[PDB]
JSON list of C-alpha atoms in Angstrom, two decimals:
[
{"chain": "A", "resi": 2, "resn": "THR", "atom": "CA", "xyz": [-17.16, -23.13, -34.75]},
{"chain": "A", "resi": 3, "resn": "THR", "atom": "CA", "xyz": [-19.99, -21.54, -36.52]},
{"chain": "A", "resi": 4, "resn": "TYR", "atom": "CA", "xyz": [-23.81, -21.78, -36.88]},
{"chain": "A", "resi": 5, "resn": "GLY", "atom": "CA", "xyz": [-25.86, -21.05, -39.93]},
{"chain": "A", "resi": 6, "resn": "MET", "atom": "CA", "xyz": [-28.81, -18.63, -40.19]},
{"chain": "A", "resi": 7, "resn": "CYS", "atom": "CA", "xyz": [-32.17, -20.11, -39.17]},
{"chain": "A", "resi": 8, "resn": "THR", "atom": "CA", "xyz": [-34.06, -21.18, -42.45]},
{"chain": "A", "resi": 9, "resn": "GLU", "atom": "CA", "xyz": [-37.46, -22.09, -41.00]},
{"chain": "A", "resi": 10, "resn": "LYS", "atom": "CA", "xyz": [-40.39, -20.02, -39.99]},
{"chain": "A", "resi": 11, "resn": "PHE", "atom": "CA", "xyz": [-40.86, -18.21, -36.67]},
{"chain": "A", "resi": 12, "resn": "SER", "atom": "CA", "xyz": [-43.96, -17.38, -34.89]},
{"chain": "A", "resi": 13, "resn": "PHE", "atom": "CA", "xyz": [-44.95, -14.72, -32.36]},
{"chain": "A", "resi": 14, "resn": "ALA", "atom": "CA", "xyz": [-45.76, -16.57, -29.13]},
{"chain": "A", "resi": 15, "resn": "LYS", "atom": "CA", "xyz": [-47.23, -13.55, -27.59]},
{"chain": "A", "resi": 16, "resn": "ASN", "atom": "CA", "xyz": [-47.90, -10.00, -28.50]},
{"chain": "A", "resi": 17, "resn": "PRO", "atom": "CA", "xyz": [-44.81, -7.69, -28.76]},
{"chain": "A", "resi": 18, "resn": "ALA", "atom": "CA", "xyz": [-44.96, -5.93, -25.39]},
{"chain": "A", "resi": 19, "resn": "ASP", "atom": "CA", "xyz": [-44.20, -2.24, -24.69]},
{"chain": "A", "resi": 20, "resn": "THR", "atom": "CA", "xyz": [-41.61, -2.20, -21.79]},
{"chain": "A", "resi": 21, "resn": "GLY", "atom": "CA", "xyz": [-42.44, 1.34, -20.74]},
{"chain": "A", "resi": 22, "resn": "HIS", "atom": "CA", "xyz": [-39.05, 2.84, -21.85]},
{"chain": "A", "resi": 23, "resn": "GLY", "atom": "CA", "xyz": [-39.35, 3.04, -25.51]},
{"chain": "A", "resi": 24, "resn": "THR", "atom": "CA", "xyz": [-38.38, -0.72, -26.07]},
{"chain": "A", "resi": 25, "resn": "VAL", "atom": "CA", "xyz": [-40.52, -3.67, -27.11]},
{"chain": "A", "resi": 26, "resn": "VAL", "atom": "CA", "xyz": [-40.13, -7.35, -25.89]},
{"chain": "A", "resi": 27, "resn": "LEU", "atom": "CA", "xyz": [-40.92, -10.13, -28.04]},
{"chain": "A", "resi": 28, "resn": "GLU", "atom": "CA", "xyz": [-41.26, -13.81, -27.27]},
{"chain": "A", "resi": 29, "resn": "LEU", "atom": "CA", "xyz": [-40.62, -15.69, -30.39]},
{"chain": "A", "resi": 30, "resn": "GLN", "atom": "CA", "xyz": [-40.90, -19.58, -31.13]},
{"chain": "A", "resi": 31, "resn": "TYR", "atom": "CA", "xyz": [-38.87, -21.33, -33.79]},
{"chain": "A", "resi": 32, "resn": "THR", "atom": "CA", "xyz": [-40.68, -24.04, -35.64]},
{"chain": "A", "resi": 33, "resn": "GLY", "atom": "CA", "xyz": [-37.56, -25.42, -37.07]},
{"chain": "A", "resi": 34, "resn": "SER", "atom": "CA", "xyz": [-35.67, -28.39, -35.42]},
{"chain": "A", "resi": 35, "resn": "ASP", "atom": "CA", "xyz": [-32.48, -27.41, -37.01]},
{"chain": "A", "resi": 36, "resn": "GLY", "atom": "CA", "xyz": [-30.92, -25.04, -34.44]},
{"chain": "A", "resi": 37, "resn": "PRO", "atom": "CA", "xyz": [-28.69, -23.77, -32.94]},
{"chain": "A", "resi": 38, "resn": "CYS", "atom": "CA", "xyz": [-28.90, -20.90, -35.66]},
{"chain": "A", "resi": 39, "resn": "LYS", "atom": "CA", "xyz": [-28.86, -17.21, -36.02]},
{"chain": "A", "resi": 40, "resn": "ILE", "atom": "CA", "xyz": [-32.19, -15.35, -36.12]},
{"chain": "A", "resi": 41, "resn": "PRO", "atom": "CA", "xyz": [-32.80, -13.16, -39.21]},
{"chain": "A", "resi": 42, "resn": "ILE", "atom": "CA", "xyz": [-34.59, -10.14, -37.58]},
{"chain": "A", "resi": 43, "resn": "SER", "atom": "CA", "xyz": [-34.77, -6.46, -38.21]},
{"chain": "A", "resi": 44, "resn": "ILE", "atom": "CA", "xyz": [-36.74, -3.41, -37.88]},
{"chain": "A", "resi": 45, "resn": "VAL", "atom": "CA", "xyz": [-37.87, -1.70, -41.06]},
{"chain": "A", "resi": 46, "resn": "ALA", "atom": "CA", "xyz": [-39.62, 1.61, -42.17]},
{"chain": "A", "resi": 47, "resn": "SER", "atom": "CA", "xyz": [-41.94, -0.25, -44.52]},
{"chain": "A", "resi": 48, "resn": "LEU", "atom": "CA", "xyz": [-42.33, -3.63, -46.24]},
{"chain": "A", "resi": 49, "resn": "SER", "atom": "CA", "xyz": [-40.78, -1.94, -49.35]},
{"chain": "A", "resi": 50, "resn": "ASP", "atom": "CA", "xyz": [-37.92, 0.03, -47.63]},
{"chain": "A", "resi": 51, "resn": "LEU", "atom": "CA", "xyz": [-36.25, -2.87, -46.03]},
{"chain": "A", "resi": 52, "resn": "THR", "atom": "CA", "xyz": [-33.18, -0.97, -44.91]},
{"chain": "A", "resi": 53, "resn": "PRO", "atom": "CA", "xyz": [-32.82, -2.08, -41.16]},
{"chain": "A", "resi": 54, "resn": "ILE", "atom": "CA", "xyz": [-33.48, 0.96, -38.89]},
{"chain": "A", "resi": 55, "resn": "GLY", "atom": "CA", "xyz": [-34.06, 1.30, -35.10]},
{"chain": "A", "resi": 56, "resn": "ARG", "atom": "CA", "xyz": [-31.78, -0.76, -32.76]},
{"chain": "A", "resi": 57, "resn": "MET", "atom": "CA", "xyz": [-31.79, -4.24, -31.64]},
{"chain": "A", "resi": 58, "resn": "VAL", "atom": "CA", "xyz": [-31.39, -4.33, -27.80]},
{"chain": "A", "resi": 59, "resn": "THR", "atom": "CA", "xyz": [-30.83, -8.07, -28.00]},
{"chain": "A", "resi": 60, "resn": "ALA", "atom": "CA", "xyz": [-28.55, -7.81, -30.88]},
{"chain": "A", "resi": 61, "resn": "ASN", "atom": "CA", "xyz": [-27.84, -10.84, -33.10]},
{"chain": "A", "resi": 62, "resn": "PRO", "atom": "CA", "xyz": [-29.96, -13.41, -31.13]},
{"chain": "A", "resi": 63, "resn": "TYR", "atom": "CA", "xyz": [-29.73, -17.08, -31.58]},
{"chain": "A", "resi": 64, "resn": "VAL", "atom": "CA", "xyz": [-31.93, -20.02, -31.35]},
{"chain": "A", "resi": 65, "resn": "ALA", "atom": "CA", "xyz": [-29.96, -22.07, -28.82]},
{"chain": "A", "resi": 66, "resn": "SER", "atom": "CA", "xyz": [-31.38, -25.45, -29.09]},
{"chain": "A", "resi": 67, "resn": "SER", "atom": "CA", "xyz": [-32.60, -28.11, -31.62]},
{"chain": "A", "resi": 68, "resn": "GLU", "atom": "CA", "xyz": [-35.74, -28.71, -29.56]},
{"chain": "A", "resi": 69, "resn": "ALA", "atom": "CA", "xyz": [-38.90, -27.99, -31.44]},
{"chain": "A", "resi": 70, "resn": "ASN", "atom": "CA", "xyz": [-40.68, -24.64, -30.90]},
{"chain": "A", "resi": 71, "resn": "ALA", "atom": "CA", "xyz": [-37.55, -23.25, -29.14]},
{"chain": "A", "resi": 72, "resn": "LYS", "atom": "CA", "xyz": [-38.31, -20.08, -27.47]},
{"chain": "A", "resi": 73, "resn": "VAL", "atom": "CA", "xyz": [-36.18, -16.79, -27.77]},
{"chain": "A", "resi": 74, "resn": "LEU", "atom": "CA", "xyz": [-36.84, -13.59, -26.23]},
{"chain": "A", "resi": 75, "resn": "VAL", "atom": "CA", "xyz": [-35.65, -10.52, -28.14]},
{"chain": "A", "resi": 76, "resn": "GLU", "atom": "CA", "xyz": [-35.93, -6.84, -27.22]},
{"chain": "A", "resi": 77, "resn": "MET", "atom": "CA", "xyz": [-35.79, -3.89, -29.76]},
{"chain": "A", "resi": 78, "resn": "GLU", "atom": "CA", "xyz": [-35.86, -0.20, -29.84]},
{"chain": "A", "resi": 79, "resn": "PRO", "atom": "CA", "xyz": [-38.05, 0.81, -32.79]},
{"chain": "A", "resi": 80, "resn": "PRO", "atom": "CA", "xyz": [-37.98, 4.34, -34.04]},
{"chain": "A", "resi": 81, "resn": "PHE", "atom": "CA", "xyz": [-40.74, 6.74, -33.01]},
{"chain": "A", "resi": 82, "resn": "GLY", "atom": "CA", "xyz": [-43.70, 6.40, -35.09]},
{"chain": "A", "resi": 83, "resn": "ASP", "atom": "CA", "xyz": [-44.60, 3.37, -37.41]},
{"chain": "A", "resi": 84, "resn": "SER", "atom": "CA", "xyz": [-42.19, 0.49, -38.17]},
{"chain": "A", "resi": 85, "resn": "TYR", "atom": "CA", "xyz": [-42.20, -3.17, -38.91]},
{"chain": "A", "resi": 86, "resn": "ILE", "atom": "CA", "xyz": [-40.72, -5.97, -36.93]},
{"chain": "A", "resi": 87, "resn": "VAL", "atom": "CA", "xyz": [-39.66, -8.56, -39.52]},
{"chain": "A", "resi": 88, "resn": "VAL", "atom": "CA", "xyz": [-38.48, -11.98, -38.43]},
{"chain": "A", "resi": 89, "resn": "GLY", "atom": "CA", "xyz": [-37.33, -14.92, -40.57]},
{"chain": "A", "resi": 90, "resn": "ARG", "atom": "CA", "xyz": [-36.27, -14.85, -44.16]},
{"chain": "A", "resi": 91, "resn": "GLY", "atom": "CA", "xyz": [-37.91, -15.25, -47.58]},
{"chain": "A", "resi": 92, "resn": "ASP", "atom": "CA", "xyz": [-41.10, -17.02, -47.82]},
{"chain": "A", "resi": 93, "resn": "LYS", "atom": "CA", "xyz": [-40.68, -17.85, -44.06]},
{"chain": "A", "resi": 94, "resn": "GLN", "atom": "CA", "xyz": [-40.68, -14.17, -43.22]},
{"chain": "A", "resi": 95, "resn": "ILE", "atom": "CA", "xyz": [-43.38, -12.87, -40.81]},
{"chain": "A", "resi": 96, "resn": "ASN", "atom": "CA", "xyz": [-43.96, -9.13, -39.85]},
{"chain": "A", "resi": 97, "resn": "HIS", "atom": "CA", "xyz": [-45.69, -7.09, -37.31]},
{"chain": "A", "resi": 98, "resn": "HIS", "atom": "CA", "xyz": [-46.53, -3.32, -37.50]},
{"chain": "A", "resi": 99, "resn": "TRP", "atom": "CA", "xyz": [-45.52, -1.34, -34.42]},
{"chain": "A", "resi": 100, "resn": "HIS", "atom": "CA", "xyz": [-46.41, 2.18, -33.48]},
{"chain": "A", "resi": 101, "resn": "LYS", "atom": "CA", "xyz": [-44.12, 3.85, -31.01]},
{"chain": "A", "resi": 102, "resn": "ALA", "atom": "CA", "xyz": [-45.32, 7.03, -29.04]},
{"chain": "B", "resi": 2, "resn": "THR", "atom": "CA", "xyz": [-43.86, -5.96, -19.34]},
{"chain": "B", "resi": 3, "resn": "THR", "atom": "CA", "xyz": [-40.40, -6.40, -18.01]},
{"chain": "B", "resi": 4, "resn": "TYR", "atom": "CA", "xyz": [-38.20, -9.31, -16.68]},
{"chain": "B", "resi": 5, "resn": "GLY", "atom": "CA", "xyz": [-35.76, -9.28, -13.90]},
{"chain": "B", "resi": 6, "resn": "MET", "atom": "CA", "xyz": [-32.07, -10.07, -13.91]},
{"chain": "B", "resi": 7, "resn": "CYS", "atom": "CA", "xyz": [-31.28, -13.82, -13.70]},
{"chain": "B", "resi": 8, "resn": "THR", "atom": "CA", "xyz": [-30.35, -14.40, -10.00]},
{"chain": "B", "resi": 9, "resn": "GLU", "atom": "CA", "xyz": [-29.13, -18.03, -10.12]},
{"chain": "B", "resi": 10, "resn": "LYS", "atom": "CA", "xyz": [-25.96, -19.62, -11.39]},
{"chain": "B", "resi": 11, "resn": "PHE", "atom": "CA", "xyz": [-25.05, -20.20, -15.12]},
{"chain": "B", "resi": 12, "resn": "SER", "atom": "CA", "xyz": [-22.81, -22.95, -16.34]},
{"chain": "B", "resi": 13, "resn": "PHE", "atom": "CA", "xyz": [-20.59, -23.37, -19.55]},
{"chain": "B", "resi": 14, "resn": "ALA", "atom": "CA", "xyz": [-22.20, -26.13, -21.33]},
{"chain": "B", "resi": 15, "resn": "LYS", "atom": "CA", "xyz": [-19.31, -26.39, -23.76]},
{"chain": "B", "resi": 16, "resn": "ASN", "atom": "CA", "xyz": [-15.93, -24.73, -24.17]},
{"chain": "B", "resi": 17, "resn": "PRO", "atom": "CA", "xyz": [-16.05, -21.16, -25.53]},
{"chain": "B", "resi": 18, "resn": "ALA", "atom": "CA", "xyz": [-15.22, -21.61, -29.17]},
{"chain": "B", "resi": 19, "resn": "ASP", "atom": "CA", "xyz": [-13.18, -19.47, -31.54]},
{"chain": "B", "resi": 20, "resn": "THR", "atom": "CA", "xyz": [-15.28, -18.48, -34.45]},
{"chain": "B", "resi": 21, "resn": "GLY", "atom": "CA", "xyz": [-12.38, -17.82, -36.68]},
{"chain": "B", "resi": 22, "resn": "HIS", "atom": "CA", "xyz": [-13.26, -14.05, -37.09]},
{"chain": "B", "resi": 23, "resn": "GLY", "atom": "CA", "xyz": [-12.25, -12.56, -33.85]},
{"chain": "B", "resi": 24, "resn": "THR", "atom": "CA", "xyz": [-15.39, -13.55, -31.87]},
{"chain": "B", "resi": 25, "resn": "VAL", "atom": "CA", "xyz": [-16.18, -16.29, -29.44]},
{"chain": "B", "resi": 26, "resn": "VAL", "atom": "CA", "xyz": [-19.33, -18.35, -29.25]},
{"chain": "B", "resi": 27, "resn": "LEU", "atom": "CA", "xyz": [-20.57, -19.78, -25.81]},
{"chain": "B", "resi": 28, "resn": "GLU", "atom": "CA", "xyz": [-23.31, -22.06, -25.00]},
{"chain": "B", "resi": 29, "resn": "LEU", "atom": "CA", "xyz": [-24.52, -21.44, -21.49]},
{"chain": "B", "resi": 30, "resn": "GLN", "atom": "CA", "xyz": [-27.00, -23.30, -19.44]},
{"chain": "B", "resi": 31, "resn": "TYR", "atom": "CA", "xyz": [-29.13, -21.52, -16.56]},
{"chain": "B", "resi": 32, "resn": "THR", "atom": "CA", "xyz": [-29.69, -23.70, -13.55]},
{"chain": "B", "resi": 33, "resn": "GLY", "atom": "CA", "xyz": [-32.38, -21.41, -12.29]},
{"chain": "B", "resi": 34, "resn": "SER", "atom": "CA", "xyz": [-36.05, -22.21, -12.98]},
{"chain": "B", "resi": 35, "resn": "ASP", "atom": "CA", "xyz": [-36.99, -18.67, -12.65]},
{"chain": "B", "resi": 36, "resn": "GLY", "atom": "CA", "xyz": [-36.87, -17.40, -16.24]},
{"chain": "B", "resi": 37, "resn": "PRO", "atom": "CA", "xyz": [-37.44, -15.58, -18.62]},
{"chain": "B", "resi": 38, "resn": "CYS", "atom": "CA", "xyz": [-34.75, -13.17, -17.01]},
{"chain": "B", "resi": 39, "resn": "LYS", "atom": "CA", "xyz": [-31.93, -10.93, -18.36]},
{"chain": "B", "resi": 40, "resn": "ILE", "atom": "CA", "xyz": [-28.33, -12.43, -18.35]},
{"chain": "B", "resi": 41, "resn": "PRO", "atom": "CA", "xyz": [-25.60, -10.66, -16.41]},
{"chain": "B", "resi": 42, "resn": "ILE", "atom": "CA", "xyz": [-22.74, -11.12, -18.77]},
{"chain": "B", "resi": 43, "resn": "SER", "atom": "CA", "xyz": [-19.57, -8.98, -19.56]},
{"chain": "B", "resi": 44, "resn": "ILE", "atom": "CA", "xyz": [-16.07, -9.14, -20.80]},
{"chain": "B", "resi": 45, "resn": "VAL", "atom": "CA", "xyz": [-13.39, -7.59, -18.27]},
{"chain": "B", "resi": 46, "resn": "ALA", "atom": "CA", "xyz": [-9.63, -6.98, -18.31]},
{"chain": "B", "resi": 47, "resn": "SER", "atom": "CA", "xyz": [-9.08, -8.63, -15.08]},
{"chain": "B", "resi": 48, "resn": "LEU", "atom": "CA", "xyz": [-11.07, -9.93, -12.05]},
{"chain": "B", "resi": 49, "resn": "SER", "atom": "CA", "xyz": [-10.25, -6.69, -10.22]},
{"chain": "B", "resi": 50, "resn": "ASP", "atom": "CA", "xyz": [-10.83, -4.30, -13.14]},
{"chain": "B", "resi": 51, "resn": "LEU", "atom": "CA", "xyz": [-14.40, -5.02, -13.74]},
{"chain": "B", "resi": 52, "resn": "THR", "atom": "CA", "xyz": [-15.18, -2.23, -16.09]},
{"chain": "B", "resi": 53, "resn": "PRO", "atom": "CA", "xyz": [-16.82, -4.00, -19.06]},
{"chain": "B", "resi": 54, "resn": "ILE", "atom": "CA", "xyz": [-14.70, -3.92, -22.26]},
{"chain": "B", "resi": 55, "resn": "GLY", "atom": "CA", "xyz": [-14.79, -5.67, -25.46]},
{"chain": "B", "resi": 56, "resn": "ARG", "atom": "CA", "xyz": [-18.20, -5.89, -27.32]},
{"chain": "B", "resi": 57, "resn": "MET", "atom": "CA", "xyz": [-21.14, -8.35, -26.85]},
{"chain": "B", "resi": 58, "resn": "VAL", "atom": "CA", "xyz": [-22.08, -9.56, -30.37]},
{"chain": "B", "resi": 59, "resn": "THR", "atom": "CA", "xyz": [-25.15, -11.04, -28.78]},
{"chain": "B", "resi": 60, "resn": "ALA", "atom": "CA", "xyz": [-25.88, -7.95, -26.74]},
{"chain": "B", "resi": 61, "resn": "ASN", "atom": "CA", "xyz": [-28.32, -8.05, -23.73]},
{"chain": "B", "resi": 62, "resn": "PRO", "atom": "CA", "xyz": [-29.35, -11.72, -24.09]},
{"chain": "B", "resi": 63, "resn": "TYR", "atom": "CA", "xyz": [-32.12, -13.38, -22.11]},
{"chain": "B", "resi": 64, "resn": "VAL", "atom": "CA", "xyz": [-32.81, -16.71, -20.68]},
{"chain": "B", "resi": 65, "resn": "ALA", "atom": "CA", "xyz": [-36.16, -17.25, -22.62]},
{"chain": "B", "resi": 66, "resn": "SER", "atom": "CA", "xyz": [-37.89, -20.05, -20.53]},
{"chain": "B", "resi": 67, "resn": "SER", "atom": "CA", "xyz": [-38.63, -21.25, -17.22]},
{"chain": "B", "resi": 68, "resn": "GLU", "atom": "CA", "xyz": [-37.51, -24.77, -18.19]},
{"chain": "B", "resi": 69, "resn": "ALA", "atom": "CA", "xyz": [-34.52, -26.19, -15.99]},
{"chain": "B", "resi": 70, "resn": "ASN", "atom": "CA", "xyz": [-31.06, -25.79, -17.55]},
{"chain": "B", "resi": 71, "resn": "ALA", "atom": "CA", "xyz": [-32.42, -23.53, -20.35]},
{"chain": "B", "resi": 72, "resn": "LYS", "atom": "CA", "xyz": [-29.82, -23.16, -23.02]},
{"chain": "B", "resi": 73, "resn": "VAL", "atom": "CA", "xyz": [-28.62, -19.79, -24.26]},
{"chain": "B", "resi": 74, "resn": "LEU", "atom": "CA", "xyz": [-26.04, -19.13, -26.92]},
{"chain": "B", "resi": 75, "resn": "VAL", "atom": "CA", "xyz": [-23.99, -15.95, -26.78]},
{"chain": "B", "resi": 76, "resn": "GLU", "atom": "CA", "xyz": [-21.28, -14.53, -29.02]},
{"chain": "B", "resi": 77, "resn": "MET", "atom": "CA", "xyz": [-18.73, -12.05, -27.94]},
{"chain": "B", "resi": 78, "resn": "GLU", "atom": "CA", "xyz": [-15.81, -10.03, -29.37]},
{"chain": "B", "resi": 79, "resn": "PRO", "atom": "CA", "xyz": [-13.10, -9.81, -26.78]},
{"chain": "B", "resi": 80, "resn": "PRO", "atom": "CA", "xyz": [-10.20, -7.38, -27.01]},
{"chain": "B", "resi": 81, "resn": "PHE", "atom": "CA", "xyz": [-6.97, -8.79, -28.33]},
{"chain": "B", "resi": 82, "resn": "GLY", "atom": "CA", "xyz": [-4.90, -10.36, -25.75]},
{"chain": "B", "resi": 83, "resn": "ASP", "atom": "CA", "xyz": [-6.18, -11.56, -22.22]},
{"chain": "B", "resi": 84, "resn": "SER", "atom": "CA", "xyz": [-9.69, -10.91, -21.00]},
{"chain": "B", "resi": 85, "resn": "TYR", "atom": "CA", "xyz": [-12.23, -12.78, -18.72]},
{"chain": "B", "resi": 86, "resn": "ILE", "atom": "CA", "xyz": [-15.72, -13.82, -19.72]},
{"chain": "B", "resi": 87, "resn": "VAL", "atom": "CA", "xyz": [-17.83, -13.24, -16.55]},
{"chain": "B", "resi": 88, "resn": "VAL", "atom": "CA", "xyz": [-21.41, -14.58, -16.53]},
{"chain": "B", "resi": 89, "resn": "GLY", "atom": "CA", "xyz": [-23.93, -14.38, -13.60]},
{"chain": "B", "resi": 90, "resn": "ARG", "atom": "CA", "xyz": [-23.67, -12.10, -10.55]},
{"chain": "B", "resi": 91, "resn": "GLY", "atom": "CA", "xyz": [-22.34, -12.07, -7.03]},
{"chain": "B", "resi": 92, "resn": "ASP", "atom": "CA", "xyz": [-21.68, -15.46, -5.39]},
{"chain": "B", "resi": 93, "resn": "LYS", "atom": "CA", "xyz": [-23.31, -16.94, -8.49]},
{"chain": "B", "resi": 94, "resn": "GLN", "atom": "CA", "xyz": [-20.59, -15.54, -10.82]},
{"chain": "B", "resi": 95, "resn": "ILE", "atom": "CA", "xyz": [-18.46, -17.79, -13.09]},
{"chain": "B", "resi": 96, "resn": "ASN", "atom": "CA", "xyz": [-15.63, -16.60, -15.14]},
{"chain": "B", "resi": 97, "resn": "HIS", "atom": "CA", "xyz": [-13.33, -18.01, -17.85]},
{"chain": "B", "resi": 98, "resn": "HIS", "atom": "CA", "xyz": [-10.01, -16.65, -19.15]},
{"chain": "B", "resi": 99, "resn": "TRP", "atom": "CA", "xyz": [-9.77, -16.00, -22.86]},
{"chain": "B", "resi": 100, "resn": "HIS", "atom": "CA", "xyz": [-6.71, -15.24, -24.93]},
{"chain": "B", "resi": 101, "resn": "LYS", "atom": "CA", "xyz": [-7.37, -13.63, -28.30]},
{"chain": "B", "resi": 102, "resn": "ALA", "atom": "CA", "xyz": [-4.63, -13.68, -30.95]}
]
């Protein structure tokens, strides 16, 4: 029993939100109807240095349903300073710049 | 921006499923209507030795919606041998015995 990587585009349902203890909560929606599937998500230093950095608090999250616009709540621990949240893959990829103080 | 721990009972929507590479996929449903909330989930050696062991592949998962019977897909890496998946808390807790070979 396995599921594939999600192939369709995600969207940020709300702003990434500072939790107050160095982590960030993000409510995503998945515009695919093809789930359950594994979410391609990482934190990167820049859009050219795509080595994953930081830590996913909600590691390896899945879209759990085939419902349209399925909601997934992810939490991450970016490094201090500037980083990008990158969700989705390829032409479907979206990104969001985060500054952690 | 924070969410609480889920307080209501979960159910196993399907059997825990061997992925073929030492991990287990579980499709849960949350009977609460009070989400988003953080799922109390761990792997334990016995129902008396409740020290969390193993590894959560999908670490720190959330119920992402207030919909009834929200689906969440979790993956875990139990230790070899016998362990229990325990989901939910207190009187709401459910458990499932797993044997990893």
